[PDB]
Amino acid sequence: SEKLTFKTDLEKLEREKAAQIGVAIVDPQGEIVAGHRMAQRFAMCSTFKFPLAALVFERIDSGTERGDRKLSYGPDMIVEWSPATERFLASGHMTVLEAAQAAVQLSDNGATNLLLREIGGPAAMTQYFRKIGDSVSRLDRKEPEMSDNTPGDLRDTTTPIAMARTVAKVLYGGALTSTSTHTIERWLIGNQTGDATLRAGFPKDWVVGEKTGTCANGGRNDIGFFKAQERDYAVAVYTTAPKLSAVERDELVASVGQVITQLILSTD
Ligand SMILES: [Br-]
Ligand SMILES: [Br-]
């Protein structure tokens, strides 16, 4: 069956690359299509910036936040990998929406932390996962320490299945207004950081949007959505490959994209 070949193809990559691959594919209602180590915890790394932007839009939707509110900051908000926050530093602020878009499409850490400083910190991020029916994902720290991915640490983790269901809830399951949903969907399609990861392994006519993440200790992740054969899906991929190079980890995730494609093409 297509599900056995999916598993054995992922196990081959896992053996040969000395890696662990967690994957969940769900339909728009969160129904499982396929998975592998789907309920093992993995560090979210930057993937949590997608749900963080969803949280931001829920606050906009409810009138407790305004997308063009200016958020002021100084040099101390600049951390590793803050390309847009660095550019906007002299101006002295980014708006809520500028920071959210940079968090999503550039994985900007300063922008992420600026939003966390506005929405009530890691506790409030965790509270939003619970609100949207995810009892698993948890943010405990800001960037970059939340990406430390110390082996066995449950802080700052999710599972493939919980996060795939979270993605589905946000894009398909009515969590946000239609306006807010469409905005975040387009940001994911226009993501700047995902060209060499999952989307590299999908057919070119599939509509795909995703958010990547990289952790210390070999974490490399990609979550998002794809539309194939008039069928919509949500997908979460988390991998741990301590001995691969960064480029090899990209290749690993693209290879997982290929394995997913083969399952979907085989699926009645
Ligand atoms: Br599992
Ligand atoms: Br303002």
Residue numbers in the entry: 19 to 286
Paper excerpt:
GES-type BLs, the target of our study, represent a unique example of this family of hydrolytic enzymes. More recently, because of the documented carbapenemase activity, as well as a structural characteristic shared by other serine carbapenemases (i.e., the disulfide bond between Cys69 and Cys239), GES enzymes have been included among class A carbapenemases, along with KPC-type BLs. The peculiarity GES enzymes share is their ability to extend their hydrolytic spectrum to carbapenems by single point mutations. Among GES-type BLs, GES-5 exhibits higher carbapenem-hydrolyzing activities and nosocomial infections caused by GES-5-producing strains that often respond only to amikacin and colistin, representing a growing concern.
In the work presented here, we set out to identify more soluble inhibitors of GES-5 carbapenemase with a higher ligand efficiency using a structure-based virtual screening approach against an in-house determined crystallographic structure. As the receptor for docking, the in-house crystal structure of apo GES-5 was used as the target (resolution 1.55 Å). In the case of GES-5, the oxyanion hole is formed by the amino acids Ser125, Thr211, Thr230 and Thr232. The alignment of these structures revealed that the binding site was rigid, with root-mean-square deviation (rmsd) values of the active site residues ranging from 0.094 to 0.274 Å. The binding sites of GES-5 and KPC-2 were structurally very similar (Cα-rmsd between 0.433 and 0.462 Å), and the residues interacting with imipenem in GES-5 were conserved in KPC-2. The major difference between GES-5 and KPC-2 was the substitution of Ser170 and Ala243 in KPC-2 (KPC-2 numbering) with Asp166 and Arg238 in GES-5 (GES-5 numbering). In KPC-2, flexibility of an active site tryptophan was observed (corresponding to Trp99 in GES-5). We assumed that this residue could also adopt different conformations in GES-5. Therefore, two different structures were used for docking, one containing the rotamer found in GES-5 and one containing the rotamer found in KPC-2. The binding sites of GES-5 and KPC-2 were very similar, especially at the level of the targeted oxyanion hole.
